[PDB]
Each structure stands twice: as structure tokens, then as C-alpha cells.
Amino acid sequence: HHHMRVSFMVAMDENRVIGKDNNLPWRLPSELQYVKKTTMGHPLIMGRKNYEAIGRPLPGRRNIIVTRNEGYHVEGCEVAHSVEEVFELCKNEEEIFIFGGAQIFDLFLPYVDKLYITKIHHAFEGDTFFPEMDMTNWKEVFVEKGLTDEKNPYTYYYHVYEKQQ
Amino acid sequence: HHHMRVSFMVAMDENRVIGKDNNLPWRLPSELQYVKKTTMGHPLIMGRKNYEAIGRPLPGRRNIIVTRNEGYHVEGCEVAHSVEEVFELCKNEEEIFIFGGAQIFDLFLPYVDKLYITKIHHAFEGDTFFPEMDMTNWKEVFVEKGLTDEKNPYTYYYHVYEKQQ
Ligand SMILES: NC(=O)C1=CN([C@@H]2O[C@H](COP(=O)(O)OP(=O)(O)OC[C@H]3O[C@@H](n4cnc5c(N)ncnc54)[C@H](OP(=O)(O)O)[C@@H]3O)[C@@H](O)[C@H]2O)C=CC1
Numbered sequence: 001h002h003h004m005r006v007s008f009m010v011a012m013d014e015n016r017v018i019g020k021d022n023n024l025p026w027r028l029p030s031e032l033q034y035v036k037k038t039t040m041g042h043p044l045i046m047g048r049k050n051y052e053a054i055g056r057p058l059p060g061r062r063n064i065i066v067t068r069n070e071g072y073h074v075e076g077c078e079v080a081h082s083v084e085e086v087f088e089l090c091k092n093e094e095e096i097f098i099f100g101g102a103q104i105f106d107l108f109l110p111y112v113d114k115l116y117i118t119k120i121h122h123a124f125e126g127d128t129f130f131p132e133m134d135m136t137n138w139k140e141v142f143v144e145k146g147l148t149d150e151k152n153p154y155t156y157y158y159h160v161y162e163k164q165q
Numbered sequence: 166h167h168h169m170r171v172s173f174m175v176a177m178d179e180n181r182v183i184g185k186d187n188n189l190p191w192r193l194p195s196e197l198q199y200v201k202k203t204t205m206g207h208p209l210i211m212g213r214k215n216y217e218a219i220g221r222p223l224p225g226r227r228n229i230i231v232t233r234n235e236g237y238h239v240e241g242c243e244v245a246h247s248v249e250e251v252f253e254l255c256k257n258e259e260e261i262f263i264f265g266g267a268q269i270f271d272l273f274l275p276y277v278d279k280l281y282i283t284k285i286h287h288a289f290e291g292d293t294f295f296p297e298m299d300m301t302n303w304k305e306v307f308v309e310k311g312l313t314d315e316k317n318p319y320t321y322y323y324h325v326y327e328k329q330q
């Protein structure tokens with residue numbers, strides 16, 4: 001019924017860890033560069049907790065915050081309270097990026113068309129996970145090794161998957 | 166319609182610069198060794214400006230120069246005036262390397278099957294750029310850090326991507 005591409009944008013470790021103590025368990029500025037370039041010009045859909053840890057709108061993109069709080073407001077951002085309200089806000093968009101965290105990934109899981117996953121080859125301590133997905137009917141359409149150096153101290157790969165049917 | 170693999174061979178910086186003042190912005194003799202070893206035994210397809218800065222045929226490869234000039238001739242080199250004429254000349258080749266510069270990379274962009282791209286981790290001043298490419302349905306099949314030493318004073322990586330669909 002919705003006409004936008006619904007894409008997930010996530011970085012996770014060997015055990016699907018995405019967070020520890022309401023923050024990111026790793027610092028990978030080069031991974032952040034990839035995220036910025038990939039998502040630029042497209043709406044970012046984020047759970048309230050994800051957004052609040054950021055604390056400011058990310059420039060050049062529609063920032064849409066998902067919350068059950070019907071009195072929630074933040075300047076420079078739009079607020080939605082359900083999947084359908086996100087779909088109404090983004091009805092004429094080409095592609096939107098579900099940007100996390102875990103509760104918001106779970107929420108949009110039935111609707112994902114395309115997956116941009118950074119896979120980090122380390123096992124971090126963590127408490128928040130990317131949902132399991134059955135990847136049948138999914139095709140890897142891109143893979144490349146991430147930049148590992150003094151500023152980016154882990155091995156990681158960018159993967160992109162597209163849903164077939 | 167054509168049966169040869171159409172490969173690109175290019176070195177570019179962090180902003181896709183490949184040239185400044187009709188020359189290469191950097192000196193990387195080790196990168197040139199990789200170029201020789203990779204292309205040897207296969208046709209090099211070069212724009213007229215690229216070739217003329219070289220000024221002589223590169224040994225052990227068919228040198229094919231692309232120009233609109235129907236009276237253009239160079240000893241030890243073959244001359245083509247269109248994509249189709251290159252395809253005619255190379256119809257029985259296994260693989261050909263589009264060798265630049267930017268106008269010639271633009272020209273053959275719809276036909277590229279394989280990308281050999283060196284990425285230099287520096288921002289040079291430049292005036293000539295490698296075209297943007299949507300890497301959907303391409304996979305990185307090779308990556309290696311280039312040699313950085315007194316003779317090769319930048320950080321760079323060899324990447325090879327192959328088109329899937
Ligand atoms: N590595 C990565 O790729 C990413 C990791 N993260 C990490 O994930 C963690 C945060 O994730 P998590 O704790 O799951 O929180 P989320 O970011 O998913 O936000 C949860 C909030 O979203 C709102 N929400 C959840 N479900 C609904 C619903 N059905 N309808 C309306 N609103 C809803 C609620 O807001 P409210 O309480 O206001 O009602 C809820 O508290 C952090 O550790 C963060 O660092 C985040 C993004 C990416």
C-alpha cells in the first residue's frame with residue numbers, strides 16, 4: 001500500500017549486538033561517513049531513545065522520531081506515533097531509512113525491502129540486538145570491506161541485501 | 166552484443182580526482198607496477214589526451230586511441246573513433262582495459278563489467294574526475310593496501326569490483 005522503499009540501516013557485530021548501555025559499543029568514524037553518504041537526502045526514521053542519544057537533527061535529511069508519547073515535540077524534527085503515520089508522512093518519498101534502535105527495527109521488520117548492514121567482526125558486550133531475519137528471498141547486491149586503521153580499530157564489511165519476493 | 170570483458174583501470178583520490186592540468190596529480194611508481202602487471206597482454210583503450218601525455222605506446226599491449234579526428238594516426242598504435250569501433254577492433258579479445266581519461270571513462274561507463282580502482286587517501290587539487298557509479302549489483306572481489314614508502318608517499322588501496330547483474 002505504501003510506495004516508498006523501506007530500507008534498514010544498521011551496524012551490528014558477530015552476535016547482532018547494536019548497543020550497550022543506550023549507546024554504540026564501538027567508534028568507527030569511517031563507518032559514520034558511509035552512513036552519512038548513503039542516507040543523505042532521505043528521511044531517517046528513529047526510535048525516541050535512538051534520537052535522544054543523538055540529541056540534535058542530522059542535517060540534510062528529514063528526521064522522523066517514533067514515540068507513543070502524543071505530546072512529544074522536538075524542533076527541527078517530525079514526530080510519528082505508528083508505522084502508518086510514518087507511511088503517511090513519507091507517502092511521496094522514494095526511499096526511507098529505518099535507523100534504529102532495536103524496538104524501531106522490530107516495528108518496521110514486516111515492511112523492509114532493502115537492508116544496509118555493516119557487519120563488524122568482533123564480539124562486543126551488549127544488551128541491544130538487531131532482530132533475526134530469514135534471508136531467503138534476499139539477494140546480496142553489494143559487499144565491500146570497510147576501512148580498518150588507527151581511527152577505525154575493527155574489521156568490518158558493508159553489505160547490502162534486496163528482497164526478491 | 167560484445168563478448169570481451171570491459172574492465173576499467175583507474176586511480177582516484179578521496180574526491181574522485183584523476184587529473185590536474187592534463188597530468189597525474191601524484192607520483193606512485195608502485196601503483197604503476199600494479200597497473201603494468203594487471204593490464205599486460207590486454208588492450209589499453211585510451212582517450213586521445215591521455216595517450217598524448219604518455220607520448221609513446223605502452224609495451225606488450227595493443228594501444229587503442231579514441232579520437233573524433235578521422236585523420237589521426239600514431240605509429241605503433243591503433244585508432245578508433247567510437248565505442249562500436251573499439252568493440253569491432255577488440256571483438257575476439259578476452260578482456261580490454263578502459264585506461265582513461267575522464268571523457269573516455271564516461272564514454273564506456275554503460276558497458277563496464279569489472280572495475281580495477283586504486284583509491285588514494287588524500288585530497289588533491291584537481292580538475293578531472295572519475296564518474297560517479299552506482300555500485301548496486303557489484304561486489305568487491307579483491308582489496309589490498311598499496312605500498313607506502315619514501316618513493317610512494319601516500320596511503321592507497323587496490324580495489325577490484327565485478328558486476329553481478
Ligand atoms: N548500531 C546501530 O546500527 C544502531 C544502534 N542503536 C542503539 O540501540 C539502542 C536504542 O535502541 P532501543 O533501546 O531499542 O530503543 P529505540 O531507539 O528503538 O527507541 C525505543 C522507543 O521508540 C518508541 N516506540 C517503540 N515502539 C513503538 C511503537 N510501537 N509505537 C510508537 N513508538 C514506539 C518508544 O518511545 P517512547 O518511550 O517515547 O514512547 C520507545 O521507548 C541504543 O543502544 C543505540 O545506541 C540505535 C540505532 C542504530
Ligand SMILES: NC(=O)C1=CN([C@@H]2O[C@H](COP(=O)(O)OP(=O)(O)OC[C@H]3O[C@@H](n4cnc5c(N)ncnc54)[C@H](OP(=O)(O)O)[C@@H]3O)[C@@H](O)[C@H]2O)C=CC1
Binds near residue numbers: 265
Ligand atoms: N588517474 C588515472 O587513473 C588517470 C588519469 N588520467 C588523467 O585524465 C586527464 C585526461 O582526461 P580527459 O581530459 O578527460 O581526456 P581523455 O583522455 O578522456 O581524452 C579526451 C579526448 O578523447 C576523445 N573523445 C572524447 N569523447 C569522444 C567520443 N565520444 N568519440 C570519439 N572520441 C572521443 C577526444 O579526442 P579528440 O579531441 O582528438 O577528438 C577528446 O579530446 C589527464 O589529466 C590525465 O592525467 C587519465 C587516465 C587515467
Ligand SMILES: COc1cc([C@@H](C#Cc2c(C)nc(N)nc2N)OC)cc(OC)c1OC
Binds near residue numbers: 009116117118
Ligand atoms: C549519525 O551519527 C550518529 C548516529 C547514531 C545512531 C546510529 C546509527 C547507525 C550507525 C552508526 N551505523 C549504521 N550502519 N547504521 C545506523 N543506523 O545510534 C547509534 C548515534 C550517534 O551518537 C549518539 C551518532 O552520532 C551523532
Ligand SMILES: COc1cc([C@@H](C#Cc2c(C)nc(N)nc2N)OC)cc(OC)c1OC
Binds near residue numbers: 174189215265
Ligand atoms: C602506465 O604509464 C603511464 C600511464 C598514464 C595514464 C594512466 C593511468 C592509470 C594509473 C597511473 N593508475 C591506474 N590505477 N589506472 C590508470 N589508468 O595517464 C595518467 C600516464 C603516464 O604518464 C602521464 C604514464 O607513464 C608512462
